[PDB]
């Protein structure tokens, strides 16, 4: 009964299951290692049925939910063990949410027909304000300022949280107990986005100090700092390999890091309305790049504050495809409000036709790993699902989900079922105000909640 | 923590070894002794400590690497 025999036993049982499920067996084994080859191998967009998606908008306790993170156990082929932390957590799906109320909450999303059920929470406050006032003493157990982002460790053993308090605490998933506090060591290094390396313990943190921080969660130790962004790093995304992709916000530059080689690739949009209008013979200049999700190890997508969704390839610096005003134009201001003049025509002149009109921003943008489909979010009140072309040169709008109402702070997708038949559940944290600040005017019908939508595949 | 990275790895079966460039990041630490490195490299490459040689180490100005 040596471990090699145990691996042989687990492997033998695994093959029997594949044989029971079913050439076909050979193909599935190749698919089990398709992730190592960094290419899209999940083509299921056409099979998705958006129209029959079961939409639900489960609300939550706290105001201005800022981020959500979902944990999905995955069977490891190398050892044939589920990623569940414990036997009790076998095949249990967990989602973690934070808000501006300094509270971290975990929810159970194992049942797709049913809806997330609160398990435990931890709330911070003024009790945790540091007395020393020197940064390195920022080792308090709880939060004392707004929470912005969350990441769940792929091992299912830890969840990490960060915000405007210049720190990074990692909590135990089961009890939400803080085990370690990692100060950022910058007066103005406030955590803005957290991304884990898939199936791995490396964490990549984007902070307001224009730098990216790489940590080893098991060792609870900082590894490397990345300089090179010229403005705050709003978003970061990662997959199994260490090519983390980041966006610099007003610098308007998407940036991919080769951590092993200490080399970086610079990507810039460089679109101008003047040429766009001439080639046409309302286009808004891109102001900042706020969201990024990397579809493939050689491709990624970004969302701009001009409502432009741009596709990228590592080979080309310029975007290969763009989708202008994806979420539409913001409703025009009312004439009864624009001016205090009684005469309506005077008020209408102040609307200045369509000059004042501006596009929605891409608050959220998530792509399922190594897949041909990605999801975009805003406060237009509907989640839009897009499919990339087979050649990975353009994408189209698959459909829309209008259940969500409010700003889509952050999006997730979780799947369940057999390999051939997989049911997809989309979790999106919905707030009434934008995560980074309160700039947005209060949207009618906006609510602070987690949006849920279960989508089925048939064909 | 201290992170050790290997680059420019060339297999030299002619001398029956692997040659490469060692980059060590050691924030908040002076530097790393050769024996400590040889240890880490021995577990990394799955070879005996005695089969690992390390030399020619220069810390960058300002430290940390």
């Amino acid at each position: 009964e040596n471990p090699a025999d145990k691996r042989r036993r687990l492997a033998k049982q695994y093959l029997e299951n594949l044989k029971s499920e079913a050439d076909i067996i050979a193909s599935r084994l190749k698919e089990d290692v398709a992730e190592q080859q960094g290419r899209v191998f999940r083509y299921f967009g056409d099979k998705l049925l958006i129209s029959e998606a079961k939409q639900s908008f489960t609300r939550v306790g706290e105001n201005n939910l800022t981020c959500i993170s979902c944990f999905q156990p995955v069977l490891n082929k190398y050892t044939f063990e589920e990623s569940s932390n414990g036997d009790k957590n076998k095949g249990r799906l967990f989602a973690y949410t934070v808000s501006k109320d300094l509270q971290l909450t975990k929810y159970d999303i194992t049942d797709f027909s049913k809806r997330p059920k609160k398990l435990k929470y931890a709330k911070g406050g003024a009790k945790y304000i540091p007395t020393s006032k020197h940064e390195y003493e920022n080792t308090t157990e709880g939060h004392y300022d707004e929470i912005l982002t969350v990441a769940a460790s792929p091992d299912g053993k830890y969840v990490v949280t960060g915000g405007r308090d210049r720190k990074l605490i990692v909590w135990s998933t089961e009890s939400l107990s803080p085990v370690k506090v990692i100060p950022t060591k910058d007066r103005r290094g406030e955590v803005l986005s957290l991304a884990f390396r898939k199936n791995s313990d490396q964490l990549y943190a984007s902070c307001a100090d224009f730098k990216i921080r790489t940590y080893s969660i098991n060792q609870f130790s900082q590894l490397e700092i990345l300089y090179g962004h010229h403005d705050i790093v709003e978003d970061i995304s990662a997959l199994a390999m260490e090519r983390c992709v980041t966006v610099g916000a007003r610098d308007r530059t998407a940036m991919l890091w080769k951590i092993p080689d200490e080399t970086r690739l610079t990507f810039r949009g460089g679109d101008e309305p003047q040429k766009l209008l001439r080639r046409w013979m309302l286009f808004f200049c891109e102001g900042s790049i706020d969201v990024v999700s990397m579809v493939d190890d050689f491709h990624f997508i970004t969302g701009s504050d001009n409502g432009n969704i741009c596709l990228w390839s590592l080979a080309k610096k310029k975007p290969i495809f763009t989708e202008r005003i994806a979420h539409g134009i913001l409703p025009e201001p009312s004439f009864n409000d624009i001016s205090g003049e009684t005469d309506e025509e005077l008020r209408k002149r102040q609307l200045q036709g369509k000059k004042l009109l501006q596009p929605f921003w891409i608050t959220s943008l998530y792509a399922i790993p190594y897949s041909n489909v990605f999801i975009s979010g805003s406060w237009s009140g509907s989640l839009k699902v897009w499919k990339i072309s087979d050649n990975l040169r353009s994408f189209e709008l698959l459909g829309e989900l209008s259940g969500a109402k409010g700003v889509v702070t952050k999006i997730q997708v979780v799947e369940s079922g057999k390999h051939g038949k997989e049911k997809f559940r989309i979790l999106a944290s919905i707030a009434k105000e934008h995560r980074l600040g309160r700039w947005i005017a209060n949207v009618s019908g906006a609510r602070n909640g987690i949006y849920s939508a279960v989508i089925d595949q048939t064909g | 923590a201290v992170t050790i990275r290997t680059r420019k790895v060339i297999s030299n079966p002619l001398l029956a070894r692997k040659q490469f460039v060692v980059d060590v990041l050691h924030p908040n630490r002076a530097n790393v002794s050769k024996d400590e490195l040889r240890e880490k490299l021995a577990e990394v490459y799955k070879a005996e400590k005695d089969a690992v040689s390390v030399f020619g180490f220069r810390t960058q100005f300002g430290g940390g690497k």
Binding site: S221, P260 | V2, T3, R5, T6, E43, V44
Partner: peptide
Amino acid sequence: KGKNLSFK
């Protein structure tokens, strides 16, 4: 391609 390790 090389390998990466971290300690202490």
